[PDB]
Symmetry: D2
Subunit: 220 residues, 4 copies
């Protein structure tokens, strides 16, 4: 196809540019053989993680799925987590959502989109979980609220995995973070849940949800 | 933690000098509401896809797992594919592997690393399926060869999903790509499997495997 | 070893008897090639589905997992459901729970048993969701109640699968059921959720959860 | 619908009979609280595991899926295994296949049946893995052989799980078995792969494949 030919062109261009440039990108990268952060984000990948964190190359270990979820029984995501924690020994796992999310929108949409709806049924359970609250908001607000709540709930799911617990239990150093950035700002905004142990996981989660429930006058 | 606070730091800075620079980044990015490419890469994420393709912001839909796999029964990945195809109408799906891959290395190591070992057993099955070839290969060369064969097999697995076959069948335009890049130079190299229908999938797959099976004395 | 040798011996004795008895069992089984009911039960398999229903051999298509769950993204169970519905054209899917379930007890337990805990986290989310009702209940009675609620919630998950809904949408005849039996008497008791359309799914689910919430002065 | 009513009618009849006719079935069942075997069979469930083994009620922990598979990354099946092994301390896991399996037939058919096709792609990979042997057969006889080979492979997958290997590594007693029965007679036939350690898994698997390849 045309787009592919061009894509390959853009790559060859950049690739050779470096080569002759005697750049050190491929040298720096090779010196950071091991990441120090696990990044769990959405497949929409609006603003890249490398852009948002300005970290050095090779510093991130990433996983992306629709609506950045951590489902209790998802072998795929759980495997990325376990490998990150038990093998790479990385000490920080970040879950990052984002406003105006297709996953979130699809979840709320009353339409059958095929296989994906099943995956999104987890989001809808989260929706009905905070129904009363979300119902107190204004229509144009519900979307971004769910996005924020979602991230809270995923961090909570992540902290309840046998993987994270056993890590904490053996005294291994590991912290869980859950932020959300706006596609227009690019500023990472902590959502409240940040665990370094199961106790801190429980506390921050309870608070994070309590705070989210305090609605500004903006919402009906 | 020191690393976290520092990360939040690098961000507020970058995002600030973007607002007080009237940059149109978040403006242009907003113009690309729907991606046109689905990128399935490795969690290692050595060289970002954004840097490899140098594409326009917001044009890539992305999924990443250990050793960029498309497991027949992986609900996570298949959901990404189905959403991209049936809902976003994306017409290009790329599977990208890379040299010096941890997943690949972990798969070849005998050590039981835990849960991740079950996930990597799919890679080990690929290894055995190409045991003759890989055996004839030199020790410090195998990893990179398996890395390339893995990409070929994943495009093959992707083209066999009911999601993709049904897409083609009902008359939807869609192509599958499988590339690999050396972490030392960042050059995207086609592994041979490219499909626009189930028929082209079969042909290019047989040819790709055939070619990959030709070993130079450089092993 | 012992247990295994005995089992094999039991099998031999049985099959011989059948052959010498000139039994018609197998020929009758062969008569029922396609099942008419999909039974989703617990791996505990306290009282076999065959004994509980006295159905003719081969009339049941079966799936069992810990705590008879229908998780939204479980490829195994959904594969069974889609095959039974889209291929076998089964019109009745029955989820069946039982009292004194090890999966339920483990879910409510506090010990981290390893991999299985993750699977059971779905049951714990159901435990918290109904925490008010359960807490307002007698401790020694909570397990039985969670077992009943679990079933109603699983039927609700089943009825929400893209698989079951599409079948109803295209006018295919299909009803869902959720029952529980006490391991002490074997009587199947309907839990209230019973659907033949998503309309009946919502209504019966609401009514079921409401009904279960009306406690008698005995906790 | 009538079918269901009849089903409920039967349950009551049987259960009622059990009570007044005073039966100790449930009492005996209650006695066998913990299972001693994990049975992984097909959802086709032609001849019930209870009828094939004629075991005491409550002795079996059961998992069933289409074509009795043990897929490396299936959270459902691995959870049953880990629970059975690490929690119930079961020492025997049995994978049982059967002739005339709808799962095997659908995997061989070149029809697109939907989601189930993705599940069966693992069977097709197995078919290709033994394409030399299987290709020397007619479609009919190929099904019976693939049925037997599938079981040998599943046992192999089970023995390669981190769950099973760890159990063996800490010295827990655990054996794996792969059998098949003809739906016309019900005789359980050992397919050859029997493991009590990783080494015996490798050897018996290789040996079993070797025997199965003799026509
Ligand atoms: Zn998103
Ligand atoms: Zn990699
Ligand atoms: Zn149970
Ligand atoms: Zn079968």
């Amino acid at each position: 196809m045309d787009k592919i030919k061009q894509l390959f062109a853009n790559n060859y261009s950049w690739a050779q540019r470096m080569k002759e440039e005697n750049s050190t990108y491929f040298k720096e990268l090779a010196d950071h053989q091991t990441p120090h952060y696990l990044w769990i984000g959405c497949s929409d990948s609006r603003v890249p993680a490398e852009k948002l964190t300005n970290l050095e190359p090779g510093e991130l270990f990433v996983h992306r799925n629709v609506a950045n979820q951590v489902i209790h029984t998802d072998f795929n995501c759980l495997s990325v987590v376990q490998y990150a924690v038990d093998v790479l020994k990385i000490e920080h796992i970040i879950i990052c959502g984002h406003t105006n999310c297709g996953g979130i929108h699809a979840a709320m949409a009353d339409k059958d989109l095929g296989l994906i709806n099943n995956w999104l049924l987890h989001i809808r359970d989260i929706w009905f979980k905070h129904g009363h609250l979300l119902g107190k908001l204004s229509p144009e607000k519900r979307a971004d609220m769910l996005t924020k709540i979602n991230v809270a709930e995923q961090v909570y799911n992540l902290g309840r995995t046998s993987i994270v617990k056993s890590a904490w239990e053996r005294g291994q150093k590991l912290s869980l973070h859950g932020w959300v950035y706006d596609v227009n700002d690019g500023f990472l905004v902590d959502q409240g849940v940040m665990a370094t142990s199961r106790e801190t996981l429980e506390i921050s989660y309870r608070n994070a949800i309590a705070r989210l429930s305090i609605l500004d006058e903006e919402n009906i």
